[PDB]
C-alpha cells in the first residue's frame, strides 16, 4: 500500500521492504539490529497511516536482502511485520517473522551476577514459549526469565 495520495512516491527497485512495524518499534529495530550501518540507500516512514486504522513504521533497504534468521530476530518486537524481497520493482517474496531458536546480542540478562555483564561476550538467550509466556534462558548463568522481564533493555 505504497504511500500514494499524491506523487513522487517511495518505491525502490531492489532490496528489502519491512512493512507493518508497530508504531514506535521502527526506530528500535534500526538501533538494535544496527540496520543503518551501510553505505546503501535507506528510506524510512515513521508514524505512517497504517493499512486499515492507526499508524505503522516502514523501512526500505535498497539492494540489501536478509536471512530467514534475520527476519526471525524481529519476531520479538514486530511479529506482525512483513518482510518483502522485491527485485526489479516487484515483490517476489513475502516472509513473516516466526519465533527463533535463540536471540543473540540484543538482550540483556536481568541477572546482575551473570558473568555476561562484565565481559567481552555476546549475550545469548534460548527462546521457549510458555503458551504466550515466552521464556528466555541465558546461555551463561542458565537462569530463565519471562520475555517481559528481559525486555527492559
Amino acid at each position: 500500500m505504497t504511500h500514494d495520495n499524491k506523487l513522487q512516491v517511495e518505491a525502490i527497485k531492489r532490496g528489502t521492504v519491512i512493512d507493518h512495524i508497530p508504531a514506535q518499534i521502527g526506530f528500535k529495530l534500526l538501533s538494535l539490529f544496527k540496520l543503518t550501518e551501510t553505505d546503501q540507500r535507506i528510506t524510512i516512514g515513521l508514524n505512517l497511516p497504517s493499512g486499515e486504522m492507526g499508524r505503522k513504521d516502514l523501512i526500505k533497504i535498497e539492494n540489501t536482502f536478509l536471512s530467514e534468521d534475520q527476519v526471525d530476530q524481529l519476531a520479538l518486537y514486530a511479529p506482525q511485520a512483513t518482510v518483502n524481497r522485491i527485485d526489479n520493482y516487484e515483490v517476489v517474496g513475502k516472509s513473516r517473522p516466526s519465533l527463533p531458536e535463540r536471540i543473540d546480542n540484543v538482550l540483556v540478562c536481568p541477572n546482575s551476577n551473570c558473568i555476561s555483564h562484565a565481559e567481552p561476550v555476546s549475550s545469548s538467550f534460548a527462546v521457549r514459549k510458555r503458551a504466550n509466556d515466552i521464556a528466555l534462558k541465558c546461555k551463561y548463568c542458565e537462569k530463565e526469565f519471562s520475555h517481559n522481564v528481559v525486555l527492559a533493555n
Binding site: 536481568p110 546482575s112 519471562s146 517481559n148
Partner: protein
C-alpha cells in the same frame, strides 16, 4: 507534669493513642514556634553503637535546635572483638552519671530496654535496637500523615515492598491500628509478605486489610502510599529482577491518584521510586525526613521538661 516526663521511649507498643497524640501535637507546635533555648545547659549522649548517619544527623540536629549540647560516638569501629570488653550494662551506668538523657542505636534487639534497667533516672530513647523497634521513625511517619492527611483514622493506607523484614511498616501498622476505621492494602511479593502475626492483630481488632498484586488496583483509593526498600541481599539477584519491575513506582502510575495522596518512603530509596516521581506533588518523602526534626524535638522536650508551655 506531662505524662511523658522522665519516660523511656523504647517501643511503639508502650505508647497509647494519647501518648501518640501528645507527641504529635507538640511536634506541630514546635514546628511553628521554635524554642531554641528550651534544653539549654542539658547534655545528651548520642550513642550510635551501630552507625546510622541519617538517623543520627537528624537526632543531633534536633538536640541542637532545642539548645542542648551533644556528646557521643558513631561506632562500628574496632568492635569486632569488643566482646572481650565490658558489658552494655556497665557502659550505661557510667554514662548515666554524666549526661541528662541517652539516645542510642544498637545492633542487638532489646538493647534499649536493658539500658533503661541501668540508666537510673536518666531517660533512654531508642533510635534502633536491631530488628525490633525504631519508635521515632514511626512518629515522624504519623506526624507526616497527619499533617498532610488531616487525621490518623479513616485512611486508605497502602504499604508496598518488603513487608516481611520491613521493621517500620510493622511498626507503623501497629500504631495506625490504634486509630479508627483505617483500611490497609498490602502489595508485597509472596516471599516478602506481611507476617501472619500482624494480620492476626488486625483481624482481632476487626480492621480491614486486603492483598493486591499491584498498586494500580488500589491507586484510586489510597490516601497514603508507603514504600519500602526491597533489600536485594534479602533475595537472589535473579529472583530480585524477576519481580522487581512489579513493585517499582514511576511518575506515570499516579495519574489517577487522588489529590491528597502522598508517597512516603522511610529510608534510602533505589529503583523502588523513580526520580520522575520526585517532580510531582504526591512525593513527600523528603518532607517526611524534615518532619523527623519536629517528631524528635517533641520527644526530647516532653521527656526532659516536666511542664511544657507551648
Amino acid at each position: 507534669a506531662n505524662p511523658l516526663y522522665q519516660k523511656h521511649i523504647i517501643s511503639i507498643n508502650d505508647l497509647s493513642r494519647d501518648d501518640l497524640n501528645l507527641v504529635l501535637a507538640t511536634a506541630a507546635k514546635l514546628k511553628a514556634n521554635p524554642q531554641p533555648e528550651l534544653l539549654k545547659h542539658k547534655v545528651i549522649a548520642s550513642c550510635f553503637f551501630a552507625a546510622s548517619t541519617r538517623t543520627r544527623l537528624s537526632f543531633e540536629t534536633s538536640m541542637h535546635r532545642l539548645g542542648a549540647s551533644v556528646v557521643g560516638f558513631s561506632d562500628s569501629a574496632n568492635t569486632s572483638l569488643g566482646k572481650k570488653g565490658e558489658t552494655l550494662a556497665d557502659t550505661i551506668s557510667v554514662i548515666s552519671t554524666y549526661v541528662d538523657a541517652i539516645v542510642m542505636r544498637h545492633p542487638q534487639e532489646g538493647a534499649a530496654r536493658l539500658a533503661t534497667e541501668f540508666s537510673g533516672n536518666v531517660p533512654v530513647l531508642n533510635a534502633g535496637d536491631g530488628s525490633n523497634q525504631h519508635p521515632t521513625q514511626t512518629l515522624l511517619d504519623l506526624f507526616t500523615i497527619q499533617e498532610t492527611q488531616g487525621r490518623l483514622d479513616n485512611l486508605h493506607v497502602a504499604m508496598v515492598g518488603d513487608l516481611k523484614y520491613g521493621r517500620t511498616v510493622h511498626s507503623l501498622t501497629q500504631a495506625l491500628a490504634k486509630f479508627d476505621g483505617n483500611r490497609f492494602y498490602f502489595i508485597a511479593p509472596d516471599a516478602l509478605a506481611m507476617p501472619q502475626y500482624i494480620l492476626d492483630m488486625l483481624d482481632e481488632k476487626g480492621i480491614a486489610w486486603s492483598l493486591h498484586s499491584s498498586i494500580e488496583e488500589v491507586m484510586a483509593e489510597v490516601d497514603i502510599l508507603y514504600m519500602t526498600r526491597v533489600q536485594k541481599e534479602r533475595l537472589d539477584p535473579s529472583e530480585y529482577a524477576n519481580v522487581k519491575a512489579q513493585f517499582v513506582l514511576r511518575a506515570s502510575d499516579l495519574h489517577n491518584a487522588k489529590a491528597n495522596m502522598k508517597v512516603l518512603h522511610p529510608l534510602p530509596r533505589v529503583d523502588e521510586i523513580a526520580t520522575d516521581v520526585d517532580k510531582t506533588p504526591h512525593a513527600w518523602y523528603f518532607q517526611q525526613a524534615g518532619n523527623g526534626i519536629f517528631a524528635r524535638q517533641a520527644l526530647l522536650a516532653l521527656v526532659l521538661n516536666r511542664d511544657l508551655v507551648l
